Amino acid sequence: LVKILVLGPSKSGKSTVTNFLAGTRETNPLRVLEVEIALDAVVQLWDVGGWPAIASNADGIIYVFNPEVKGSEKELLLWYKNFARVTDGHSLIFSHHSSLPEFAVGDNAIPPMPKQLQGIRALETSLDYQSDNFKEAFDALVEQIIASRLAAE
Numbered sequence: 211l212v213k214i215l216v217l218g219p220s221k222s223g224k225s226t227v228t229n230f231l232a233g234t235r236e237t238n239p240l241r242v243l244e245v246e247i248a249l250d251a252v253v254q255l256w257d258v259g260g261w262p263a264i265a266s267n268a269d270g271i272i273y274v275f276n277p278e279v280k281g282s283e284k285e286l287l288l289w290y291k292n293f294a295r296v297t298d299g300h301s302l303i304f305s306h307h308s309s310l311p312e313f314a315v316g317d318n319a320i321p322p323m324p325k326q327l328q329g330i331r332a333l334e335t336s337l338d339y340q341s342d343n344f345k346e347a348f349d350a351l352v353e354q355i356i357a358s359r360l361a362a363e
């Protein structure tokens with residue numbers, strides 16, 4: 211199995227980003243959706259509502275935030291702090307247009323992140339608004355998780 215944590219400030223869209231990825235098409239403490247992807251074991255997404263048993267055995271993290279909302283960028287460092295040397299940089303950050311883009315647009319439709327977070331691959335994300343093909347980053351993320359393990363031997 212592979213367990214990928216979905217963390218992010220409240221109302222950011224981490225639930226909305228989740229069911230799209232797990233195939234199926236308001237807040238809640240935790241919602242684990244099951245799906246499986248095959249290219250070239252199981253994939254379970256743990257949408258956390260905006261913990262220490264949650265962080266356990268975690269293999270990757272997807273941060274989701276609203277780029278219109280001020281201070282969100284530094285709120286991820288806590289989700290980075292808490293759920294985190296648990297993860298390495300396998301993390302993914304979604305600059306998620308939940309609203310018609312006003313501020314995100316332009317020279318950072320993915321705004322500047324903290325130094326620890328930057329250097330983690332970032333994407334412009336939204337289901338209706340301008341976005342990046344982030345199902346591909348997911349597929350590519352799942353593949354990068356499994357391969358590492360028995361590669362070491």
Ligand SMILES: Nc1nc2c(ncn2[C@@H]2O[C@H](COP(=O)(O)OP(=O)(O)OP(=O)(O)O)[C@@H](O)[C@H]2O)c(=O)[nH]1
Nearest residue numbers: 220221222223224225226237238260308336337338
């Ligand atoms: N138009 C539009 N609205 C979106 C989009 N994604 C999220 N939203 C807005 O955000 C709401 C859904 O976001 P959620 O997934 O519930 O937010 P969350 O990250 O789960 O945050 P919590 O409340 O803590 O669970 C909807 O009411 C939408 O209005 C989107 O792609 N397009």
Ligand SMILES: [Ca+2]
Nearest residue numbers: 340341342343
């Ligand atoms: Ca696009």
Ligand SMILES: [Mg+2]
Nearest residue numbers: 224225237238
């Ligand atoms: Mg949610």
